[PDB]
Design a protein around this motif. Structure first.
Motif, PDB file in Angstrom:
ATOM      1  N   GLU A 136     -19.902  33.289  10.724  1.00 27.72           N
ATOM      2  CA  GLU A 136     -20.350  32.425  11.894  1.00 27.72           C
ATOM      3  C   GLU A 136     -20.440  33.105  13.184  1.00 27.72           C
ATOM      4  O   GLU A 136     -21.346  32.830  13.871  1.00 27.72           O
ATOM      5  CB  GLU A 136     -19.166  31.239  12.009  1.00 27.72           C
ATOM      6  CG  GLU A 136     -19.623  30.038  12.798  1.00 27.72           C
ATOM      7  CD  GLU A 136     -18.448  28.896  12.760  1.00 27.72           C
ATOM      8  OE1 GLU A 136     -17.740  29.395  13.406  1.00 27.72           O
ATOM      9  OE2 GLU A 136     -18.741  27.891  12.250  1.00 27.72           O
ATOM     10  N   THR A 178     -24.034  32.908  15.118  1.00 26.39           N
ATOM     11  CA  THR A 178     -23.971  32.375  16.590  1.00 26.39           C
ATOM     12  C   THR A 178     -24.915  33.747  17.365  1.00 26.39           C
ATOM     13  O   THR A 178     -25.689  33.172  18.003  1.00 26.39           O
ATOM     14  CB  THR A 178     -22.768  32.447  17.089  1.00 26.39           C
ATOM     15  OG1 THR A 178     -22.271  31.283  16.123  1.00 26.39           O
ATOM     16  CG2 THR A 178     -22.863  31.748  18.373  1.00 26.39           C
ATOM     17  N   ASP A 179     -24.560  34.813  17.131  1.00 26.40           N
ATOM     18  CA  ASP A 179     -25.415  35.754  18.059  1.00 26.40           C
ATOM     19  C   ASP A 179     -26.776  36.103  17.318  1.00 26.40           C
ATOM     20  O   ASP A 179     -27.543  36.390  18.219  1.00 26.40           O
ATOM     21  CB  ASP A 179     -24.576  37.097  17.820  1.00 26.40           C
ATOM     22  CG  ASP A 179     -23.658  37.428  19.097  1.00 26.40           C
ATOM     23  OD1 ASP A 179     -23.753  36.981  20.029  1.00 26.40           O
ATOM     24  OD2 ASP A 179     -22.723  38.097  18.953  1.00 26.40           O
ATOM     25  N   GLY A 180     -27.063  35.497  16.326  1.00 31.50           N
ATOM     26  CA  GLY A 180     -28.389  35.234  15.644  1.00 31.50           C
ATOM     27  C   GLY A 180     -29.179  34.167  16.227  1.00 31.50           C
ATOM     28  O   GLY A 180     -30.429  33.872  16.307  1.00 31.50           O
ATOM     29  N   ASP A 181     -28.309  33.337  17.019  1.00 31.09           N
ATOM     30  CA  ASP A 181     -28.860  32.278  17.852  1.00 31.09           C
ATOM     31  C   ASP A 181     -29.130  31.192  16.967  1.00 31.09           C
ATOM     32  O   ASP A 181     -30.009  30.185  17.253  1.00 31.09           O
ATOM     33  CB  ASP A 181     -29.918  32.768  18.719  1.00 31.09           C
ATOM     34  CG  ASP A 181     -30.016  31.760  19.979  1.00 31.09           C
ATOM     35  OD1 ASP A 181     -29.263  31.125  20.282  1.00 31.09           O
ATOM     36  OD2 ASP A 181     -31.057  31.685  20.570  1.00 31.09           O
ATOM     37  N   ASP A 182     -28.198  30.937  16.083  1.00 29.77           N
ATOM     38  CA  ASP A 182     -28.530  29.848  15.062  1.00 29.77           C
ATOM     39  C   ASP A 182     -27.267  29.461  14.596  1.00 29.77           C
ATOM     40  O   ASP A 182     -26.245  29.980  14.749  1.00 29.77           O
ATOM     41  CB  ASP A 182     -29.574  30.039  13.894  1.00 29.77           C
ATOM     42  CG  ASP A 182     -31.008  29.802  14.452  1.00 29.77           C
ATOM     43  OD1 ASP A 182     -31.375  28.829  14.399  1.00 29.77           O
ATOM     44  OD2 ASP A 182     -31.852  31.008  14.390  1.00 29.77           O
ATOM     45  N   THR A 183     -27.391  28.371  13.493  1.00 27.52           N
ATOM     46  CA  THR A 183     -26.488  27.673  12.729  1.00 27.52           C
ATOM     47  C   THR A 183     -27.024  27.485  11.320  1.00 27.52           C
ATOM     48  O   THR A 183     -28.205  27.542  11.391  1.00 27.52           O
ATOM     49  CB  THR A 183     -25.590  26.514  13.279  1.00 27.52           C
ATOM     50  OG1 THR A 183     -26.521  25.314  12.959  1.00 27.52           O
ATOM     51  CG2 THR A 183     -25.318  26.456  14.684  1.00 27.52           C
ATOM     52  N   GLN A 232     -23.073  45.536  11.151  1.00 28.10           N
ATOM     53  CA  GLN A 232     -23.904  45.965  12.044  1.00 28.10           C
ATOM     54  C   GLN A 232     -23.891  45.135  13.517  1.00 28.10           C
ATOM     55  O   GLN A 232     -23.922  45.799  14.531  1.00 28.10           O
ATOM     56  CB  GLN A 232     -25.307  46.084  11.595  1.00 28.10           C
ATOM     57  CG  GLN A 232     -26.599  46.122  12.561  1.00 28.10           C
ATOM     58  CD  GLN A 232     -26.794  47.546  13.099  1.00 28.10           C
ATOM     59  OE1 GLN A 232     -27.561  48.085  12.713  1.00 28.10           O
ATOM     60  NE2 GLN A 232     -25.686  48.083  13.890  1.00 28.10           N
ATOM     61  N   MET A 233     -23.548  43.977  13.275  1.00 26.40           N
ATOM     62  CA  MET A 233     -23.641  43.320  14.182  1.00 26.40           C
ATOM     63  C   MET A 233     -22.208  42.725  14.530  1.00 26.40           C
ATOM     64  O   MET A 233     -21.789  41.898  15.760  1.00 26.40           O
ATOM     65  CB  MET A 233     -24.176  41.757  13.848  1.00 26.40           C
ATOM     66  CG  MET A 233     -25.896  41.869  14.380  1.00 26.40           C
ATOM     67  SD  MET A 233     -26.737  40.511  13.484  1.00 26.40           S
ATOM     68  CE  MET A 233     -26.926  39.526  15.077  1.00 26.40           C
ATOM     69  N   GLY A 234     -21.106  43.437  14.144  1.00 28.44           N
ATOM     70  CA  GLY A 234     -19.716  43.298  14.564  1.00 28.44           C
ATOM     71  C   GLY A 234     -18.608  42.439  14.162  1.00 28.44           C
ATOM     72  O   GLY A 234     -17.790  42.755  14.512  1.00 28.44           O
ATOM     73  N   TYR A 235     -19.069  41.573  13.257  1.00 32.28           N
ATOM     74  CA  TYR A 235     -18.103  40.681  12.823  1.00 32.28           C
ATOM     75  C   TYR A 235     -18.074  40.567  11.142  1.00 32.28           C
ATOM     76  O   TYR A 235     -18.744  39.677  10.901  1.00 32.28           O
ATOM     77  CB  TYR A 235     -18.344  39.205  13.499  1.00 32.28           C
ATOM     78  CG  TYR A 235     -18.153  39.377  14.953  1.00 32.28           C
ATOM     79  CD1 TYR A 235     -19.295  39.423  15.608  1.00 32.28           C
ATOM     80  CD2 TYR A 235     -17.112  39.176  15.630  1.00 32.28           C
ATOM     81  CE1 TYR A 235     -19.542  39.473  17.259  1.00 32.28           C
ATOM     82  CE2 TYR A 235     -17.259  38.993  17.300  1.00 32.28           C
ATOM     83  CZ  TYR A 235     -18.507  39.030  17.784  1.00 32.28           C
ATOM     84  OH  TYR A 235     -18.366  39.009  19.139  1.00 32.28           O
TER      85      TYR A 235
END
Ligand code: B12
Ligand code: B12
Ligand code: K
Ligand code: K
Ligand code: K
Ligand code: K
Ligand code: K
Ligand code: K
Lengths: 137, 551, 177, 551, 137, 178
Positions: free
Chosen positions: B229, B233-238, B267-270
């Protein structure tokens, strides 16, 4: 109700694919596009078609694809710019709880998009709990 | 002293690659991590209350979406209790029909199906992939891009790509405002090379749907979903915004798939301390749950992440197999650079190539890698001959074919002229006949005259701001004498109106004939059954350049 | 230590400024980008590029998200020109502007290891021109098909690290360089 | 004008490779030729009167030998009548035991078994091969040669390869008369790198057997057989002289295998209008019939012949599969150059690498291909890091491992000093301390001081002419302080007294422990069963150079 | 008669293995080789050992292998030189039929190599038919 | 037509020669080696090197087998020195010696595409020195790992063609070089 044996529609029952205008697939020609008989406004897929495809998906045992297709059928009546406003409203931190519900009421009341309204309502609720509403970032 | 043996080894390209030891806690580990959840399911009053050890009370947006929409609950408890080793056996056993397995896999939890495929070696995975692939016929997808966003070269390179065999082609932009220009170039050109090839222009989500709203694309692919999640979110979606978008494309009669792939979360840190494979399984179920027909995965753009670690390439094969086993179309990456080594990248490709997938690559580069705006593909234009030779050597249909120089040149030329007509009719910044020439005989943008990108970007944004749609291209084509192309474009639109190509794995081949998992059902049952390279297709594949006639 | 905290950055009210937003560890837990150029030279060059165009340059730090698009959006919301420059500690950089979708931009530099100081300068420069409502030629496209093979894993790790300093809901800080 | 695209393509290494159109009349077709006999067999009072369409009246020496010795006639009728498709399905069905299949395949005629595997694609064949491989554990064999026949460099290189994991190593000679030195050096360095590594010196048959009699080799592989009578005749043997040679080796307690390979009959001018695969099946049955335990095949030295024609590399996998399915040890080639292209040779290697064979390569080059006296191998010393990387990527045991530079220098140095000691002890031309140092850090013979060749050649033949045996080597080692090696060499000699390593797929691992198909039974039965890469072996494979620990 | 359970001989029954000159495996130490308390003449596998391995081959399902081993058994008594001689005699165009038949006669009377002499007789007969005798080239 | 069969070659009586044995298509159906060196220039160079050493070269055509080894063997059988050089139309060459097994030799040139006219000359010289009972240094080893990739298919086809002129039981013909 359409089955796999009616697929592909273009080949088995192209007559099932009609515009709200009586026109047929066969009418979509260079000649009439140029002579403006056919226009942009005749070339949008219809809900009726999307529900045929849903019935076929179903028969293909792809219930989830079919659900998608039912949603899509509802959304055909929704303006493009409204489509984009609603998609953006569901993105994280864009909307209040209340805004999402207004969107859901509109889908239901003005577009009879019952399934998407319910879908947006479900999102609203969960965005509370998972803090994806405006001001939660 | 230095061993000279080791000085030679140290200089090999493979030693330029990024390798790392596993890092469990940040999920820098490809599969079978000690932090991955034990499969489980609890159902009460028809709803899931526990998913893979997690109580619904703790569900994130991904859990809720999957639990609610992504698993068949009637058989969930039955399959949970089945032996995972036995299911893995079933997957590669050639006498267990795909149709007997799909009701089983679609009832598994993300962890359960990961567990099943983690019992398998890549030979068992490929043995199973040839059976679980939804379309009987394998296909290929190509990237058509260049570092200048030059629309003439794109049109030319698109028609060559279509002519070589790709049934889907993808473009994208160095400079986002060029995008309308890349899309129409790709479409026009792809249509010239073979009527029926589908095209997409990969952009920010709201930007891309608009372009499809305008009629300048016939499908979309990079509709991203993510495995945790905070990354989502950093993907700008749900999951819900993505589900709504997926239905919005369908409502405009446009085919689409989600894109995912192992490694994105890291890659995106979480990564929430999970393995890439587990996280990717969640992505696949999000996709199933949203009712999307298909998915692009196999690490895709984050291939540098699983490839750095042990068994990462096996794991990429594993995520592809889970995708097909869950009855989704699989566009199985082989589209992104991960290594300086030809040996290594060949190994990585063969995993999908040998069994075949819905799209063996989700982006073979149809242009030289310098021109590839996805930062390079696992294969590029300079490998076309190698690819054809390997099809011939192993008698594998890799979706492509040997082609003649003079054929390519005419088609590239026709495409360059068709676009020129279009810029003429739509009053866009012109395309010199010098430009047409160049594009005809180009290898890459290095061979192209350069354009006024400011002028270009001005007239491309006006497309969107003025809502100029695809019919303008159609009349401009006709206006320029390409009544052929003009009609072919109308026929895509005909396909969008009937929706037949919205179904799982759909492409459009030959005479506007849809070819999907609905009418091209995979019926693999072992040797001499299922798809077999043969007849005229085999002849076509055999006919590589350079084969001397013995006598 | 060149980047001095200083109170919560605030709105512009003056078009003639460009904001530079940088990640929660920029020049903090990390001071060089992924191919070791110090944050100080990069900061110096971006600021020189903007000032060199006659535009004000304001540097703030974002904490809400380590994602460069969102760092830059935190900045474009407070930039008097509507234009921001977002930079992560590994060096990834974007030119953004108010009204754009967060994942859209004016220009993007998606391959941090190809960026040079001369590049970082031009970026300061093309941003300023954008602030002036001018349409500069985009900084030329730098693309290297072996950049991911050489650096994607490294980038992952650098980014994971800066991400530990994300702090939800904490507003961006004005900074003195 | 020219296409810059095709120009770039024309320059790629693959287009340097030799390709040809099928030439059916001359057998220049890989498999599935129309001249290949349809399967049949006739038996009367326990004797074949018809074999694949041919009456016993028409038998050549090969038909007679196979008919009389190569086919289990008790179930021959039975299997002849079974469906070839079903049998092919059985081959790749993970739940059909190898033990259930062997009695069936060893009852088949050559044409029957070729027909069975021709129904399979390469995926299915690899699924079958992982099961039909005789030894549970896959292994590897390396070439150790140099262009100067430099004995010091062979010893060092032999030690390194052994250290890297080869369990068999093969030498051969630029200058024939050099042979005894090559063998002793191969045999000493190998025992130094890892006691138990088996060694062979590939020569003219009578010359090789005497070498083995003198004790300077552990085994013999290049014991050739051929698929048509005229070709066998130009090979200076018959099925009966070769069957006698196999027993002579065994009568001396030496392990051996035959060698054959698709395309040899074409390369030697008499294919009798048959496909390479049909002809190779005859070679496999000749091997079976002779009572030989194993076979090196997969085109081997003639790989430019099947690889020239369609489906050639698949036929190469299929001929390996037939060998294994006939319950013969399979040394699966992957040892000979056929292409300038790294992608193409990788695809060829993986067919055997992925599922595993008794020896994945029957001659990986442990030296750079410049020094390869078999005219170059499909892999060489500079590919060592790639091979290891792919092992880690796919979690496949390719039989080799990453090693450290200092470990290698040390083992190379110890072997050079041992052979220096040997040479002093036996009164052979000195091996100077500089030579020892050079063999230590050498990459290839480019790094080696030149030797009085004429001299060396003198004393090497004397070894022959004066019947100097391996005990001279043993005492010479103990005399020169190399008791270790001396004992280790005794041990290999002791293995020839017990006969255990004469059995199917035998190698010698650990503490003088034979590992064959008899005590290391392949028990494949699908996912999570049979050989699995895991535990310490996987830890070893994981540990490649360049891997950063995120710490 | 040995069974798969009896293999490897060197692990399960080392006692079974003796040599030509009747020595034990453990007789073969470096010092006994230094001391010459064992030589070249004593390190040869015996007909008995090959017959133990043939029985194990038979037990492992490999009848052909076993037969090969049985032939190997008989050939242990034939000296190296004559082995080379006989092997060469069976190569194409080397022998007269009569010469092969004399080799067979020898293998049987001198060496009691009954299976090998029949093998040679078989070869000679077929070499006549397929013309692989001296002067046939 | 630089090659003319002048009857059946007979056994040399003095140790002052080397026999060059050529395959049944050499200088006939085939006129160049695998890389187009004329059969005329190879023999010339071959002969030059022998004669260069004070030895006589006698040339014969062989028919019983196209195999280079057996070709050479027919010639070592009739060589007054017991030394022969076997040469196939594609260029493959072997220096053989009476008493050696057929598939044995003195020196072997197993990668024909690598041979030059100089190599051949050298090859002809070494032969004579062998016939003279010298112990020459072997011709330097020629090995190219890409040799088979570029030419094995070509070599099999040239060998197939030459192999058609094989005549079982037919004694070698002595040649006169035009
Ligand atoms: C890897 C990659 C990604 C990965 C990782 C991104 C991440 N945030 O970690 C994934 C697949 C998740 C991704 C997603 C998207 N991407 Co992307 N991505 C790339 C790719 C293929 C290579 C970059 C790289 O490996 N550089 C090497 C390393 C060493 O350098 P780096 O500076 O550390 O690289 C970072 C940046 O590239 C950044 N990044 C990647 N994509 C994007 C997109 C945007 C808008 C931003 C601001 C940053 C960004 O992530 C990398 C890792 O931190 C590029 C192609 C290219 N031309 O470079 C496309 C590319 C940059 N992506 C792009 C797009 C459009 C996006 C999406 C918006 C698509 C979508 N469906 O929403 C999303 C944005 C999500 C996000 N928050 O970043 C476009 C940008 C077009 C433009 N702006 O002009 C490109 C050019 C082409 C494409 N279509 O893939 N992407
Ligand atoms: C392909 C090959 C073969 C093939 C084909 C041979 C043929 N006659 O058609 C096979 C596997 C059948 C073969 C067999 C043998 N080979 Co071989 N072979 C080679 C190899 C690997 C490469 C040759 C090549 O591709 N050249 C490129 C092509 C384009 O050039 P070419 O001139 O047309 O090449 C021809 C010659 O090489 C010839 N040839 C091949 N082997 C031999 C052996 C001898 C004794 C002769 C006279 C000719 C010869 O065959 C090639 C094709 O026609 C070489 C290794 C090397 N360093 O070259 C070994 C090599 C030549 N072979 C060798 C040996 C020992 C033999 C055997 C005697 C082994 C045995 N078990 O009996 C047999 C002889 C059979 C015969 N009648 O020729 C040795 C020669 C040693 C020496 N004399 O100094 C080499 C050097 C390798 C080795 N040391 O193991 N071989
Ligand atoms: K997108
Ligand atoms: K993912
Ligand atoms: K793609
Ligand atoms: K041999
Ligand atoms: K063969
Ligand atoms: K070998």
């Amino acid at each position: 109700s359409a089955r796999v044996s009616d697929y592909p529609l273009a080949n088995k029952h192209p007559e099932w694919v009609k515009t709200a205008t009586n026109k047929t697939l066969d009418d979509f020609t260079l000649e009439n596009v140029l002579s403006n008989k056919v226009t942009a406004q005749d070339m949008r897929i219809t809900p009726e078609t999307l529900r045929l495809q849903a019935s076929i998906a179903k028969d293909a045992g792809r219930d989830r694809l079919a659900m998608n297709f039912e949603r899509a059928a509802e959304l055909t009546a929704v303006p493009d710019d409204r489509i984009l406003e609603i998609y953006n409203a569901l993105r994280p931190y864009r909307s209040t709880k209340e805004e999402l519900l207004a969107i859901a009421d509109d889908l239901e009341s003005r577009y009879q998009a019952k399934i998407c309204a319910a879908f947006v309502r479900e999102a609203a609720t969960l965005y509370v709990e998972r803090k994806k509403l405006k001001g939660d970032d | 002293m230095r061993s000279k043996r080791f000085e030679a080894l140290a200089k090999r390209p493979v030693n330029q690659d990024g390798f790392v030891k596993e890092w469990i806690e940040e999920g820098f580990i490809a599969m079978e991590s000690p932090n991955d959840p034990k499969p489980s399911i609890k159902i009460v009053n028809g709803a899931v209350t526990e998913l893979d050890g997690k109580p619904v009370s703790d569900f994130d947006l991904i859990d809720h979406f999957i639990a609610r929409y992504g698993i068949n609950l009637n058989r969930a408890e039955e399959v949970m209790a089945m032996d995972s080793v036995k299911l893995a056996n079933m997957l590669c056993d050639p006498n267990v029909k795909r149709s007997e397995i799909v009701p089983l896999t679609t009832a598994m939890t993300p962890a359960k199906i990961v567990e099943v495929v983690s019992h398998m070696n890549v030979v068992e995975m490929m043995m199973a992939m040839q059976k679980m692939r939804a379309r009987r016929t394998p296909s290929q997808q190509a990237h058509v891009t260049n570092v200048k966003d030059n629309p003439v070269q794109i049109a030319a390179d698109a028609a060559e790509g279509a002519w070589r065999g790709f049934d889907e082609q993808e473009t994208t932009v160095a400079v986002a405002r060029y995008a309308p220009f890349n899309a129409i170039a790709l479409l026009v050109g792809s249509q010239v090379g073979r009527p029926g090839v589908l095209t997409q222009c990969s952009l920010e989500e709201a930007t891309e749907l608009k372009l499809g709203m305008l009629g300048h694309t016939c499908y979309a692919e990079t509709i991203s979903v993510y495995g945790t999640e905070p990354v989502f979110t950093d993907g700008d979606d749900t999951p819900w915004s993505k589900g709504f978008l997926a239905s919005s494309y369908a409502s405009r009669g446009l085919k689409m798939r989600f894109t995912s792939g192992s490694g994105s979360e890291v890659q995106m840190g979480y990564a929430e301390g999970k393995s890439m494979l587990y996280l990717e399984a969640r992505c696949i179920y999000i996709t199933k749950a949203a009712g999307v027909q298909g998915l692009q995965n196999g690490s895709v753009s984050c291939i540098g992440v699983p490839s750095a670690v042990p068994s990462g390439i096996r794991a990429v094969l594993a995520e592809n197999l889970i995708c097909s086993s869950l009855d989704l179309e699989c566009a199985s990456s082989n589209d992104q650079t991960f290594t300086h080594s030809d040996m290594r990248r060949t190994a990585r490709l063969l995993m999908q190539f040998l069994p075949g997938t819905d799209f063996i690559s989700s982006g073979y580069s149809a242009v030289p890698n310098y021109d590839n705006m996805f930062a390079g593909s696992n294969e590029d234009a300079e490998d076309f001959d190698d690819y054809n030779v390997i099809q011939r050597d192993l008698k594998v249909d890799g979706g492509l074919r040997p082609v003649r120089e003079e054929d390519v040149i005419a088609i590239r030329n026709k495409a360059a002229r068709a676009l020129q007509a279009v810029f003429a009719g739509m009053g866009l910044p012109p395309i010199t006949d010098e430009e047409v020439e160049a594009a005809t005989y180009a290898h890459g943008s290095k061979d192209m005259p350069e354009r006024n990108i400011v002028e270009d970007i001005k007239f491309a944004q006006e497309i969107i701001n003025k809502n100029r749609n695809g019919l303008e291209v159609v009349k401009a084509l006709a206006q320029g004498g390409f009544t052929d192309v003009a009609q072919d474009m109308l026929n895509i639109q005909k396909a969008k109106l009937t929706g037949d190509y919205l179904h799982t794995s759909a492409i459009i081949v030959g005479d506007g004939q849809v070819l999907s998992a609905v009418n091209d059902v995979n019926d693999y049952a072992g040797p001499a059954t299922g798809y077999r390279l043969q007849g005229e297709r085999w002849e076509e594949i055999k006919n590589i350049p350079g084969a001397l006639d013995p006598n | 230590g060149f980047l001095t905290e200083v109170g919560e950055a605030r709105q512009g009210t003056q078009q003639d400024e460009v904001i530079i937003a940088v990640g929660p560890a920029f020049g903090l837990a990390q001071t060089v980008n992924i191919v070791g150029i110090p944050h100080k030279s990069i900061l110096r060059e971006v600021i020189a590029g903007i000032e060199e165009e006659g535009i004000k340059a304001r540097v703030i730090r974002c904490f809400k998200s380590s994602d460069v698009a969102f760092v830059a959006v935190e900045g474009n919301r407070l930039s008097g020109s509507g234009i921001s420059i977002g930079i992560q500690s590994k060096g990834t950089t974007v030119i953004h502007q108010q009204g754009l979708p967060p994942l859209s931009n004016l220009e993007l530099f998606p391959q941090a290891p190809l960026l040079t100081l001369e590049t970082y300068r031009q970026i300061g420069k093309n941003a300023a021109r954008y602030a002036k409502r001018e349409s500069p030629q985009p900084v030329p496209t730098l693309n290297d098909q072996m950049a991911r093979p050489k650096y994607q894993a490294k980038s992952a790790i650098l980014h994971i690290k800066e991400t530990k300093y994300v702090v939800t809901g904490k507003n961006p800080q004005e900074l003195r360089v």
